[PDB]
Each structure stands twice: as C-alpha cells, then as structure tokens.
Amino acid sequence: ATKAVAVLKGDGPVQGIINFEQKESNGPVKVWGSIKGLTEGLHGFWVHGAGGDLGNVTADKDGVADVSIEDSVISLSGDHSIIGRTLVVHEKAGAGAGSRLASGVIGIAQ
C-alpha cells in the first residue's frame, strides 16, 4: 500500500507528522497527524497546492494539536496529488491575515 509522510519544522521543537493511506485509485485517502511544540491556541494547518483545505487545529495544554480531516479521491497521486506538497501553519487562524511559521513537504513512505 502506497503511503505518505510529512514532518513539520519551524522554531525547532515544533513538529508535525502527517501519515496518508493510498492502496489504489479506487481507495480513498484520509489525512491525519499531530503537531507538537507550540502552546494552546489556534494554528490553521493545510496543504498549499492541493486544495489547501484541512480545517483548523487547536493545541493542548501540553502543546499538541491533533489533526483529522476527510479522505478524497486524491489517491495520493494524479492531478489532486499531495506528494511533495508544501505545508504551512498560520500563527493564529481566525483573522485571515497570512503568515508562514513551519513547513513540511510530503514524501511517499513505503
């Protein structure tokens, strides 16, 4: 089964791993991961280049904002592929200003 993984990196301690599931074109691809480091708050996470729609995430007291979205016909490939994409987490979603703190390109994990 073809899978993918992308790690986040910014100030240093901030991390963010996102695993994917792509067995076949017929099979969907659900996105999910966990961003640790930052503190409780809001950090709009998404994938620039591939929809860029992955809702927002709220950090925890320990400093971990779990991420969970729905699967699409992307199939981790094709026109709607998210392999090698560019991830970016805003400083504080809700306003709509725009800023780049961390980043983590997607990479097939087989």
Side-chain angles (χ1 to χ4, degrees), residues 13-83:
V14 177
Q15 309 128 130
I17 266 292
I18 28 271
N19 312 260
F20 300 76
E21 256 191 50
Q22 160 44 220
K23 59 215 266 224
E24 63 197 327
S25 113
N26 300 264
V29 172
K30 231 141 72 191
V31 183
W32 80 83
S34 331
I35 283 69
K36 316 174 222 184
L38 37 51
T39 46
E40 253 230 52
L42 212 298
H43 278 239
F45 166 78
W46 59 68
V47 179
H48 199 31
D53 186 359
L54 291 311
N56 279 351
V57 293
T58 312
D60 299 339
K61 68 180 210 152
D62 190 33
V64 186
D66 258 318
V67 188
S68 56
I69 10 281
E70 307 190 275
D71 65 68
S72 286
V73 196
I74 51 193
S75 185
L76 288 183
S77 190
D79 281 319
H80 306 283
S81 81
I82 336 87
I83 316 303

Side-chain angles (χ1 to χ4, degrees), residues 72-108:
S72 286
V73 196
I74 51 193
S75 185
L76 288 183
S77 190
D79 281 319
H80 306 283
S81 81
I82 336 87
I83 316 303
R85 280 295 185 198
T86 294
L87 268 44
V88 285
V89 276
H90 201 17
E91 57 216 343
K92 172 64 75 161
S99 196
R100 170 148 119 283
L101 287 93
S103 56
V105 198
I106 292 79
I108 298 295

